Write a protein that binds this ligand. Structure first.
Ligand code: VEC
Lengths: 300, 237
């Protein structure tokens, strides 16, 4: 178990860690988060009490270093930093742990939700989507746009997701125009899986990361990307049987974790109705279809 | 964006553009099988690709052999149309290629878009107008050449005959759409009006009769009357 400590909390803020969250009052004696499960990526995120604009946060993996947060009063936000003095951090962490100034990452033992939402997400792939190589951790916020959104403005602050575009030369073989547009298997299996992602695990990692950025930051481009990655699979007649089964598990836990009051903005009617009820894989997503129907039958 | 009454004069400016109509590409007569089931038999069709400024018509004849052993023909027809329009553009010299293609039915947008990926600067536009180009097979010489075809074939016409010697493109298009609207609403009556008196002929190199300017006014009036009529006879007004 690892710990992400705080110098202090000078402004009132709602702090999230993965799917959990708690409210911290202005100058309350908060000094961090302990008992963080090792073995998964994590995301700590923030919504200031005074400006609910800009949800922002940091993707990190406690295996890659000791990370701590100090409020920056010039830039006006909680920043993640990487301590290089391992004994300073441990003396500091222990000191705070003895004063019980930390919240405990509140994982129920039965609960596999976080694992299931981050199964294929690796820090190394996050750091290629979010380019800032001087830090081991990755900043994301509500307003950041994607490479693809930019093509249709600051490149240093972009989400470099894999561009998917169903009416593009990459997607459509000269001479198979109709074949490839109505059955995207070529583009899924040859272009993306074999060519770009190399394996389905990396494809699923990006899909899961896009969902989590949509959910935790309301990042519109990330939601576009999540839906595009689902639609490419559902609109392919030929999908490895193992991918279909795992996709069902993936989406199941994403829909299960979504706030009930956000389905209006984060869920795209056309994609889900096509994916669950018309596409090649309309019958291959029983668990996802089941929870979509018992939980959001309005959208459909 | 979509083409409508507001931007109607853009059709006759000096940017090359084509209308593409796919109504008559996949044509079937529906009949009964000996077992009393229903079957379709295809007949020859055509793509109606028209330059509204110049009248040049690229009539790609679609021979029934193109459907042999194919499934979901109505969907195939849209993709075949888009394949053939893309091939026509690639066949034209660069300075003759269109800057826009306007499809008469919105279901042609994605098919044509995907076939024209090599031409990112050719705009594919739908239209809000309800153009009567389906009636092109009511023009006797076009119907004749389609039905006689024994192989795929492109036939070139000027759908305005020699009208542009005397009238503008705007006026020629209006006359064309009036004639075709009339043939579409009551083909029998329309053809009676056109092929009326025995001193009016169709030149061998033309599609329509050789009306004087005054006779065209009379003809056009008669066609308007027919269109409103049928609109009464239909609606009872
Ligand atoms: C409290 O006054 C200090 O000088 C020390 N603080 C809390 C830090 O900067 C700090 C906090 C957490 C971890 C770390 O590695 C350092």
């Amino acid at each position: 178990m690892n710990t992400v400590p705080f110098t202090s909390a000078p402004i009132e803020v709602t702090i999230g860690i993965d799917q959990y969250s708690f409210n911290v009052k202005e100058n309350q004696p908060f000094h961090g988060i302990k008992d963080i499960p090792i073995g998964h990526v994590h995301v700590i995120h923030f919504q200031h009490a005074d400006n609910s604009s800009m949800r922002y946060g940091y993707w990190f993996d406690c295996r890659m270093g000791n990370f701590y947060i100090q409020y920056d009063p010039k830039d006006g936000l909680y920043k993640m930093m990487e301590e290089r003095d391992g004994a300073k951090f441990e003396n500091i962490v222990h000191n705070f742990k003895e004063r019980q100034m930390m919240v405990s990452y509140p994982k129920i033992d039965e609960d596999d939700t976080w694992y299931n939402l981050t199964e294929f997400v690796q820090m190394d792939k996050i750091r290629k989507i979010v380019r800032k190589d001087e830090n081991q951790f990755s900043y994301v916020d509500s307003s950041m746009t994607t490479v693809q959104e930019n093509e249709l403005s600051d490149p240093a602050h972009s989400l470099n997701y894999t561009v998917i575009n169903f009416k593009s030369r990459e997607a459509i073989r000269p001479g198979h125009e109709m074949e490839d547009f109505l059955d995207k298997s070529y583009y899924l299996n040859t272009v993306m899986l074999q060519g770009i992602f190399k394996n389905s695990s990396n494809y699923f990692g990006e899909l899961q990361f896009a969902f989590l950025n949509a959910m935790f930051f309301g990042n519109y481009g990330s939601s576009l990307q999540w839906h595009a990655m689902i639609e490419l699979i559902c609109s392919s007649a030929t999908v490895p049987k193992h991918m279909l089964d795992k996709l069902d598990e993936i989406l199941y836990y994403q829909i299960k974790t979504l706030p009930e009051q956000y389905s209006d903005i984060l869920l795209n009617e056309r994609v889900w109705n096509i994916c669950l009820y018309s596409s090649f894989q309309k019958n291959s997503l029983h668990n996802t279809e089941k929870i979509m129907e018992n939980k959001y039958p309005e959208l459909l | 964006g979509a083409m409508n009454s507001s931007n109607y004069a853009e059709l006759f400016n000096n940017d090359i553009k084509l209308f593409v109509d796919d109504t008559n590409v996949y044509r079937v007569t529906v009949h009964k099988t000996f077992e009393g089931n229903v079957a379709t038999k295809a007949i020859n069709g055509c793509i109606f690709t028209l330059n509204p400024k110049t009248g040049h018509l690229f009539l790609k004849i679609i021979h029934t052999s193109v459907w042999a052993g194919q499934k979901r023909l109505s969907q195939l027809a849209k993709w075949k149309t888009a394949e053939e329009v893309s091939a026509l553009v690639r066949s034209l010299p660069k300075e003759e290629q269109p800057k826009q293609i306007i499809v008469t039915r919105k279901a042609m947008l994605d098919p044509l878009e995907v076939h024209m990926l090599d031409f990112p600067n050719i705009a594919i536009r739908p239209t809000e107008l309800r153009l009567p180009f389906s009636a092109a097979m009511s023009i006797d010489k076009l119907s004749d050449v389609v039905m006689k075809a024994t192989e795929p074939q492109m036939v070139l016409f000027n759908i305005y005959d020699d009208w542009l010697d005397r009238i503008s493109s705007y006026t020629a298009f209006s006359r064309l759409t009036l004639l075709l609207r009339a043939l579409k609403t009551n083909e029998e009556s329309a053809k009676m009006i056109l092929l009326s008196d025995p001193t009016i002929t169709i030149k061998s190199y033309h599609l329509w009769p050789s009306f004087t300017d005054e006779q065209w006014i009379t003809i056009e009036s008669q066609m308007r009357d027919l269109i409103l009529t049928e609109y009464g006879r239909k609606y009872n007004v």
